[PDB]
């Protein structure tokens, strides 16, 4: 069995970025949100969009924000450690599965690697036990097309799924994603896409009327 990727303090966030969070009103985020080292002004969410707390490094930001620089610094530090831990895992079980396109597949537990961009153009399933772990290592971008849905089967849980991407993630309109995203650059969601997972970006997270829920 493959070890969990430990998120440390970042586990407490639904969205954590380094250069902000952009949004087309109205999104529905469940869980805490934060950005650092950038100013809290870079968080373009209103308070009715977030059920949880909005954290800022400073006095700027949405009206309900809490200022807490040391927690955001630890969180961001922990996200970096997680990203490096995930990208650093060795001996994949798969390499270049589907040649970079994985529509229709059922993915069983393990460590998967892609040395290019990964596309998800049609529905997929992630299947395994309540304690199985999946780590997806993607050296380019990650794309998912509109209305694509990731289904979990067999007791598989979103909190045990990790997607590490060296490039940007793009989730298409109406799509539904499962798992923790650790991106080295951005994560960008389109109209009414949803995610059950965490969006951890080393640049920005962009949203357009999305539903974002932290995995239980």
Curated annotation (Swiss-Prot):
GO cellular component, one term: extracellular region
Keywords assigned by UniProt, alphabetized: Antifreeze protein, Disulfide bond, Secreted, Signal, Stress response
Subcellular location per the Swiss-Prot or TrEMBL entry: Secreted
Effect after changing residue 188 to Y: Has 43% thermal hysteresis (TH) activity of that of the wild-type
Site (Ice-binding): 191
Motif (Ice-binding site motif (T-A/G-X-T/N) 2): 185-188
Chief place where the protein resides: secreted
Sequence motif Ice-binding site motif (T-A/G-X-T/N) 3, location on chain: 203-206
Effect noted on mutating residue 174 to Y: No effect on thermal hysteresis (TH) activity
Cysteines joined through disulfide linkages: 47-64
Motif (Ice-binding site motif (T-A/G-X-T/N) 1): 19-22
Biophysicochemical property: temperature dependence: Active at low temperatures, even below 0 degree Celsius. Thermal denaturation midpoint (Tm) is 56.4 degrees Celsius.
Domains: entry comment: The ice-binding site is formed by three T-A/G-X-T/N motifs.
Stated role: Has antifreeze activity for survival in a subzero environment. Binds to the surface of ice crystals and inhibits their growth. Has high thermal hysteresis (TH) activity, which is the ability to lower the freezing point of an aqueous solution below its melting point, and thus the freezing of the cell fluid can be prevented protecting the organism from ice damage. The TH activity of this protein is 2.2 degrees Celsius at 5 uM and 2.5 degrees Celsius at 50 uM.
Record family assignment: Belongs to the ice-binding protein family.
Quaternary structure and interacting proteins, as annotated: Monomer.
Protein's name in the database: Ice-binding protein
Source species of the chain: Flavobacterium frigoris (strain PS1)
Lineage: Bacteria, Pseudomonadati, Bacteroidota, Flavobacteriia, Flavobacteriales
Residues of the full protein shown: 61 to 276 of 276
């Amino acid at each position: 069995t493959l070890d969990l990727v430990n998120l440390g303090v970042a586990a407490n966030f639904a969205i954590l970025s380094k250069t902000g969070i952009t949004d087309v009103y109205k999104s529905a985020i469940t869980g805490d949100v934060g950005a650092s080292p950038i100013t809290g002004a870079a968080i373009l969410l209103k308070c009715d969009e977030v059920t949880g707390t909005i954290f800022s490094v400073d006095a700027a930001g949405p009206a309900c924000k809490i200022t807490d620089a040391s927690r955001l610094t630890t969180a961001v530090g922990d996200m970096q450690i997680a990203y490096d831990n995930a990208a650093g895992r060795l001996n994949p079980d798969f390499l270049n599965l589907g040649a970079g396109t994985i529509g229709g597949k059922t993915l069983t537990p393990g460590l998967y690697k892609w040395t290019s961009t990964l596309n998800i153009p049609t529905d997929i399933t992630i299947s395994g036990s309540s304690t199985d772990v999946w780590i997806f290592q993607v050296a380019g971008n990650l794309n998912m097309s509109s209305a694509v849905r990731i289904t979990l089967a067999g007791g598989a849980q979103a909190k045990n799924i990790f997607w590490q991407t060296a490039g940007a993630v793009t989730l298409g309109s109406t799509s539904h994603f499962e798992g923790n995203i650790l991106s080295q650059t951005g994560i960008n969601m389109k109209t009414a896409a949803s995610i059950n997972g965490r969006m951890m970006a080393q640049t920005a997270v962009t949203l357009q009327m999305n539903t974002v829920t932290i995995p239980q």
